[PDB]
Amino acid sequence: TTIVGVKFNNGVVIAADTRSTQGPIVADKNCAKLHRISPKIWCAGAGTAADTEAVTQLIGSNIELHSLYTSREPRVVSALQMLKQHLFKYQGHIGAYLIVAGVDPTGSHLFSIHAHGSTDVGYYLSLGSGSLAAMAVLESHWKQDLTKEEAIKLASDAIQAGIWNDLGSGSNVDVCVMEIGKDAEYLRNYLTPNVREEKQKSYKFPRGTTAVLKESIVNICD
Amino acid sequence: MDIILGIRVQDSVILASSKAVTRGISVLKDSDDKTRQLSPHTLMSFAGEAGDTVQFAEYIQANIQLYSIREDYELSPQAVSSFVRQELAKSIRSRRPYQVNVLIGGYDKKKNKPELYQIDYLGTKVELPYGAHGYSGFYTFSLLDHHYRPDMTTEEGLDLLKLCVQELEKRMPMDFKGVIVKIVDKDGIRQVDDFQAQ
Amino acid sequence: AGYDRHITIFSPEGRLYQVEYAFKATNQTNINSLAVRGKDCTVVISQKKVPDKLLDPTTVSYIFCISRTIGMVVNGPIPDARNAALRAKAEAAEFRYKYGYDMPCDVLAKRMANLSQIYTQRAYMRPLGVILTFVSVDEELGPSIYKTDPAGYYVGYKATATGPKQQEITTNLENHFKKSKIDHINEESWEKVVEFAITHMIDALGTEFSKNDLEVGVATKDKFFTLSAENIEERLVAIAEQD
Amino acid sequence: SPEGRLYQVEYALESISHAGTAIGIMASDGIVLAAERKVTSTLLEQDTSTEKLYKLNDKIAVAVAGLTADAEILINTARIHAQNYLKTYNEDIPVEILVRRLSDIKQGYTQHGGLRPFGVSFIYAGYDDRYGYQLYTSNPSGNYTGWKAISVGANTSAAQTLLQMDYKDDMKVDDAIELALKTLSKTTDSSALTYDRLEFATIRKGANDGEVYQKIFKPQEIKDILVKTGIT
């Protein structure tokens, strides 16, 4: 899996690939690794498929209920502290490695959370099996104070680096742009570089090819 | 392990069950009824771990003699089966798991048909024409495949049974000291004590 | 029998006798307090009454510092005030730790009012005879003043007053926000907002104060602190040299 | 409990003869359930509740006469016993066993006298392949009883009489649909019976084969069978 986050002047953007691997096989060629915690707090999931989802569904639910008790917009730094402390209760046995970013009433924030409970604050971050490909792009092209469109090119550029140069990553590029003023925009499959060329044949079978023993109709509703 | 057989015919179900109890080096008993009666028309043969074996079959005996006595109804085989299964499936993620394999065979007094169920210590349950646990299956399933008709008289089926035991005595390294054959039909559970020479 | 007067259950006319009585306790100290909003400060004046010459004024306080940001002033018997202050000082430390931002004035109030409510619905625990007035300069809402009562109620005030001569003080303030037609006191430095809070209380109580009859709490952004013996005399000296 | 009396029970047993009015009639090839609805306002939403006729499983159902919030606490736990006897024996739960399972919780308060008895009295209509179609009754006493036809709630003593009169053992299902409505001629405090004061149910020999369909009537279907005489 390849995921990255990139801070710019009036916000932050986070990106991911779309390939989920069980061992050497590709089970979903397009599952979104982009998870929503609050309207304008999203995070990128790498590690045990199930745990990034479950622990997101949770902290996001608790965080929703909390924005309601407090009559206040949910803060990135809350989702961090709750995730941090949950993962750590669980001595690393929960396999989530996240890039957590968003906008709240305090500005733009970008953090990364490791399974054992460590957190890192930064301006560019990358995690997962293509972590190193992406971070190599990021380290070469990041200047202070990007722009919305520069920062997006950069994260998508850095996800590609992962896709190609890593067997762990591949297929498409998801993005989410959280500008400070505006709503959050989630561009699913913002890039589709990996389209399967049309096959050489078509393997639609002439009806009646398959030998049938018994046939019957089951009943659906009582 | 330890020979657990069973074949369901037209009018009944038949269970074979090795007579031997072995404690490592010595054969301790040459006459073990490896089966508890769960109720008038329902029998359960069993083999597996040392103590775990009996203690389970008896727990089931109790719990079924209790549902019998309470609703004054003889619980149907399908149900006794699907209960025994759940009781094993429960104990597989438990602290110390019952390590027991069983054959349940009995007469469904309401469908007037015979039924044979096979359940392994994991809770794996399937209904069969014939079945076996341990290695018992390898020597005998090739014969049953071949000679089994589902319209077989109870007599025709005892014959085919003797033929399996004979093959097990020939190509199997264990001296299991014979079988006890029990039959389950409309009239209940009776035992043929003239077998190793019928 | 006639025992719906002794626990937190319903009288025949839907009344909670024990709560109404609990309120009556908040006066038992005989101190009055008021609170105001500034352009960017909040102020709480309470009376200090030290009758026993054997007392040490420095230990006599109905103003509690709950956090860096949040101040609380109680009208009620001292024992109950502390039971509440200690529980708030800890609900707000826990809040910071669990959730990552300082605890906001109106949330602390909702949480103590929620608490004050359980007392109002459980047989075995009694409400407290206190009315907690919470102040701060909360990072989202500005100057805040939120008050909770034994009933379980909380709400936010432009300014407020509590205690025995509560309504004499309250009606003075009402007639000065009917007149500036806003939600605050347009003065920049908190000093002038403290002077104003003391002024409109002298006016309403018809007695003068010395540096010893007052307790002042103040909230600016990033701090809540209390004024010392002398920090007040300065405020009084300035009132007297214009009035 | 002075003379051998169950006081806190009679209290609620006669609180029952106040609320609701329910009926059950076992035909030879079906069963029938029926109820009148509590004092209704113009603005109360008729179609939604199904407030006094609850489904327990695809083969069992109960009519209620008692406090609603109180029966839901029971039914919730009975719909579960049903499913536990499935997941366990892979056969549908037998009616008497479900009935006893409740009756035993009712009597659970009729003795651990530290919590308050149950409102609610039940008619149960069910089918299981051991005892054909069945009709049962459940007062908070703890007792259950077999019935070819029965009633609970206000005007109880009265309907039991008309029922005893027009009932025949050879009865069909449609014959029993009438007997039920017909004899909510009398036992109705509301002069004239409407489709909206009603809730209905049937467990027939299937709309097709040799099996068992269950049917809680939608309002329109009632105004349709009401058409057979009641109102037109």
Added chain:
Amino acid sequence: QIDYALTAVKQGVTSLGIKATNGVVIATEKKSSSPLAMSETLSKVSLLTPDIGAVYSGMGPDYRVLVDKSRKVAHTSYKRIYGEYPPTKLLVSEVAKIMQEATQSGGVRPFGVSLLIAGHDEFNGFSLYQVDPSGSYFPWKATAIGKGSVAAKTFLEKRWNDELELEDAIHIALLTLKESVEGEFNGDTIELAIIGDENPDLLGYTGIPTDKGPRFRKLTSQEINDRLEAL
């Protein structure tokens, strides 16, 4: 004892609800315990799920801790299992169960509030429910609770047809509230919410077309005054 709590409900500010063909509406008044108090800091109409809101009559606090306990139960008992939010009927059930337990439990008094819960689920459409301290709950086309209960309930029978557009029911529930009003009558002393069309404006994000935003919308101090002039 349940009977005495229904009595605290019978006094305490009036509130109401009206179901229509394409929406639901609920409102109450905001009686200011003082002019010094800023009445915007307390909400009598609270969101439970983005498809479901609630209003009350009676004891303030008991409502707050019931709105809280209520939001949570929506997650703990539905959202965290099935990924959806709960349907009005069932979330209501889970609240009645909550209050019905304060009744039948020892050492605690029932709540001093009747609730009006309004909402929309994909399969049952619109619906409006009342929940009493007794833990009983009933489905309403429209009703009112509190002091003005009897006056308003009678006005609603007079004015209600099953062909109301939501805008018609807003209009009604303003008149209804105008006759009962205790204090002044404007946007600062009226709280009104609706359960209408999906508001994508209010989602906070854009990019999945399958989730379209809150049906629950709480009318602003302005939107109210605007309707009261053309009233």
Added chain:
Amino acid sequence: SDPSSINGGIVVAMTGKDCVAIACDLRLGSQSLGVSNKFEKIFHYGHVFLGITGLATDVTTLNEMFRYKTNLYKLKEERAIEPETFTQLVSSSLYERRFGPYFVGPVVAGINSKSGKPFIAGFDLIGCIDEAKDFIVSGTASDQLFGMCESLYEPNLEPEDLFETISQALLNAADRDALSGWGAVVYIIKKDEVVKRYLKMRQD
């Protein structure tokens, strides 16, 4: 030894033009020994279908369980449960036992009765939801099936066509699989009719 690989079996699901298909083998065996050839891996709950591969006593247990859970959804919710929803119930339900999982590889398939939209999805033993427009595979021939589908599939197949397609994907994977076969069954699910054909294949 390996739980997913003791009894074995495979399950596969595809979409077409306003339809869906799900299919499995009828094999149940302890390691090398085949025991039953009539052990179906596909169960239904209303109009929502669930195929489950892997360990028998867990495949069985989960059926017995989702029947229960969905039966109560019907009574409490006044309706039959939807596919999209049931999916989310299998996830949360599987992840309940995260640190002591059911060794299964579930596939959900059926048609949303309100929107008429076809729906398939699969899970890993702890509930990751792989939703997919094309196809879902699971079993001891995880690999073989992926191979067949990736070639033989085109979207929007008419039903009588998608039967031939899904049958050939299943059949030809299980023939290159030691632990799958012994029969096969294939449900074709139209918007209101559902046909269940059994297949003829080698028996080894």
Added chain:
Amino acid sequence: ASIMAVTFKDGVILGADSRTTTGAYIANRVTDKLTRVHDKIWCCRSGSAADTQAIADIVQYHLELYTSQYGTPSTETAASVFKELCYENKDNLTAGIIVAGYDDKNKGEVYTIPLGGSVHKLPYAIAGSGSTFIYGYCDKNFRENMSKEETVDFIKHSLSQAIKWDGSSGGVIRMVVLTAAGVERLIFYPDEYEQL
């Protein structure tokens, strides 16, 4: 990691590198290993980032609450809250911490909490992976009662070395100066500390 703290005439100074490595990979090269538990009581973290973070987080609380009730906390106390956590939880933690702070009475105070959970008060203390290489430089070049810029230099050199020789240490050099006049955060970049 690679961290140290030094006392002097005017107070105390904390210093650290910024390199958290998992393996051979520098996962973050700008880590803030100087962490704050109170106005003028900070720590130096080394060991598991997840463990040192969790602890400091939990101490920041204990002390925010101690302030609420009982007042301003002695530097000594901060140390005791650290030891109590580290020692009473030794079996499940890998953290070596340096607590340092300024009050008005004692001025410069420094407590080092090794892995065991023991606590040792000292004039200066070094720790973290790359400390091994400067036990020599420090013992020879340290003096009591140094001037502010004398101490900044002592730290800049000591840490310039540790990073030269350690692969598990590097990044920028962060400092934090704790005196009466307040909290001053320092940073020195590679182009600077390498040329020494």
Added chain:
Amino acid sequence: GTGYDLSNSVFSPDGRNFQVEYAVKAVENGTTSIGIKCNDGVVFAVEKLITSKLLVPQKNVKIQVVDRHIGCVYSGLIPDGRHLVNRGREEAASFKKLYKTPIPIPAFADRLGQYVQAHTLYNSVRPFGVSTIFGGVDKNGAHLYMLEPSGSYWGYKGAATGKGRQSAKAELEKLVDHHPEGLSAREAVKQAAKIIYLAHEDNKEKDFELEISWCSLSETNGLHKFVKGDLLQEAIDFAQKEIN
């Protein structure tokens, strides 16, 4: 409904918890005990009544010590004094164990305050039958506190409680008047002995031993030692001279 005073948690119609006020009466009807805050410590004194001739002299100690640096004395139901001082120590040792410094007087007081106050919250536990006078020396000098059954506590320059309450309180106000800067550690001891000898005329029926302890930053280097031997006679003889 009436009956507003048989239960402890219960509010009288005008804000009062009556059971507490009754406990204060038990305080008022017991031994008289005092505290004086001097310029670098605190001095404590108590009246030990002598039931019969068989009570052993000097051997029934009433003043209890907390930690090493804190003194407690109480008036009233004596066993409640002990149960309170016990919870007092469990608390002062929770504090030391975690924060290393021995518990500060003001923070100690707040801890007793909450134990007592919490005994005024439920109908099923009665308030303490003691007003407790306690104090010592911490990081910022000397502190004297007094804590009644209601949970109320404040810091005093001097304090009294017991049968001879009003009487001592008045001689106490006399010193705070003459010497505003506080007494000397040694002088405060001579005077406490006077004040007890006087407040004894309000109980002059039975006989009594005096008992004094102190905590002085100069005379016991911050610790809480008792006053004994020569220095005790020093003061017993100073009282006799100001009684005659």
